[PDB]
Amino acid sequence: RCRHQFQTQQRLRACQRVIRRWSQPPTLQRCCRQLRNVSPFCRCPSLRQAVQSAQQQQGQVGPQQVGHMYRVASRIPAICNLQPMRCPFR
């Protein structure tokens, strides 16, 4: 259950911070360690939850900005050399 892994690896708190960072230990290194601890099958699902979760920490976020948060997140597996490297977030 990807949901469990997300919660277990600190709801990818560091990736939340990276996703906020770019949508308007070093943080990225922590992100990639939290995400590595999630199973490959569950990384994109968990990044989805990180994006949702990062929305809470900041003001109301418009749908353009939210899409940008998803865009950032989708680049994180590849940045970290983590399979599956990309997330479509369909």
mmCIF file of C-alpha atoms in Angstrom, residues 2 4-19 25-40 42-44 46-47 50 53 57 76-77 80 82-83:
data_model
loop_
_atom_site.group_PDB
_atom_site.id
_atom_site.type_symbol
_atom_site.label_atom_id
_atom_site.label_comp_id
_atom_site.label_asym_id
_atom_site.label_seq_id
_atom_site.Cartn_x
_atom_site.Cartn_y
_atom_site.Cartn_z
ATOM 1 C CA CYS A 2 1.581 3.176 -1.328
ATOM 2 C CA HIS A 4 1.284 3.520 3.964
ATOM 3 C CA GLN A 5 4.731 3.983 2.512
ATOM 4 C CA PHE A 6 4.016 7.729 1.917
ATOM 5 C CA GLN A 7 3.025 8.186 5.565
ATOM 6 C CA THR A 8 5.931 6.090 6.768
ATOM 7 C CA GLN A 9 8.518 8.019 4.845
ATOM 8 C CA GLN A 10 7.390 11.270 6.498
ATOM 9 C CA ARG A 11 4.781 12.009 3.892
ATOM 10 C CA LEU A 12 7.933 12.895 1.768
ATOM 11 C CA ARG A 13 8.171 16.166 3.724
ATOM 12 C CA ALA A 14 11.432 17.118 2.123
ATOM 13 C CA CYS A 15 9.966 16.599 -1.408
ATOM 14 C CA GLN A 16 7.078 18.796 -0.354
ATOM 15 C CA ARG A 17 9.579 21.486 0.352
ATOM 16 C CA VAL A 18 11.259 20.959 -3.025
ATOM 17 C CA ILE A 19 7.955 21.016 -4.827
ATOM 18 C CA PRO A 25 21.598 17.220 4.658
ATOM 19 C CA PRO A 26 20.410 19.457 1.752
ATOM 20 C CA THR A 27 16.614 19.460 1.222
ATOM 21 C CA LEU A 28 16.853 17.745 -2.181
ATOM 22 C CA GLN A 29 19.166 15.036 -0.759
ATOM 23 C CA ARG A 30 16.554 14.337 1.978
ATOM 24 C CA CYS A 31 13.812 14.273 -0.542
ATOM 25 C CA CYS A 32 15.606 11.693 -2.698
ATOM 26 C CA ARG A 33 16.337 9.510 0.501
ATOM 27 C CA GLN A 34 12.690 9.695 1.614
ATOM 28 C CA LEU A 35 11.507 8.882 -1.858
ATOM 29 C CA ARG A 36 14.111 6.058 -2.280
ATOM 30 C CA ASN A 37 12.614 4.448 0.839
ATOM 31 C CA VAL A 38 9.320 4.209 -1.002
ATOM 32 C CA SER A 39 8.854 1.250 -3.339
ATOM 33 C CA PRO A 40 9.315 1.973 -6.973
ATOM 34 C CA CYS A 42 4.557 3.584 -5.066
ATOM 35 C CA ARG A 43 6.832 6.515 -5.749
ATOM 36 C CA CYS A 44 4.510 8.324 -8.247
ATOM 37 C CA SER A 46 3.387 8.997 -3.098
ATOM 38 C CA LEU A 47 4.661 12.078 -5.003
ATOM 39 C CA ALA A 50 3.306 15.004 -1.509
ATOM 40 C CA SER A 53 0.119 17.840 0.996
ATOM 41 C CA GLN A 57 1.483 24.370 3.933
ATOM 42 C CA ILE A 76 11.918 14.365 -8.921
ATOM 43 C CA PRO A 77 12.281 10.575 -9.600
ATOM 44 C CA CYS A 80 17.046 11.420 -7.814
ATOM 45 C CA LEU A 82 14.800 6.770 -9.001
ATOM 46 C CA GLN A 83 12.641 4.507 -11.169
#
